[PDB]
């Protein structure tokens, strides 16, 4: 299956309506919300429990973390990507019991986006003064500070037989933003067939990507087409759009918006647990 740029790529709200009108792509019965399960739910035999969080934004003190096997964090684990914030997050990870902790970057991890960092100091450096102060040596090893994680960036890991792929890019003045269309499709084309769990920082079109204040959809159209038509992971986890915290299905893939922080800037949305059968 070859994904090409959608005719509605640049206009996600119109893409949503187009596909809903013609194909009922976002309609019941197959597309619907999925209620969360409480942390005392027994894990089914032969399954692994994923604990999904995102957009913790250095506010990890006091998050009540549930029993599970593998943590998935879908980015914005810092405010600015400062090396000290990355260290604090890594320290928090090392105290969690989970066998594996898988992490991707998001928009706030400015120091992880080498193009952003190179551009910032040549332009309006005073838009991010604490970041602009950093010397090249201060952030050349930033991802290496995540010693308690497996860090993914357009890359994958097989853990307990699960194929997990992660990428930070979003279609939205922050890090890891790319123009809608081919620029993002080039990234999504890297996701392999056979991926069980896809981690991206933001949503695909139509799944937990409505922004009330803007009355628009903001998910990536190319990512949706890739997920449903080519890759078909069992789980697509993401954050970014805090208003969309919660879970949906399309009948095959489960979509989890794991945004921990709310529009009130507090990390009060509970971690979401999700069980998958072992390969
Ligand atoms: Ca260094
Ligand atoms: Ca918060």
Curated annotation (Swiss-Prot):
Key words of the record: Cobalt, Hydrolase, Manganese, Metal-binding, Nucleotide-binding
Function: Displays low metallophosphoesterase activity (in vitro). May play a role in the development of the nervous system.
Binding site for GMP: 107-108, 213-214, 242-243
Leftover remarks: This protein has a low affinity for cofactor and demonstrates very restricted substrate specificity. The enzyme may need additional interacting proteins to show full activity, or may be losing its activity and acquiring the role of a scaffolding protein.
Gene name of the encoded protein: Mpped2
Protein name: Metallophosphoesterase MPPED2
Keyword Manganese: yes
Organism: Rattus norvegicus
Record comment: activity regulation: Inhibited by nmolar levels of AMP and GMP.
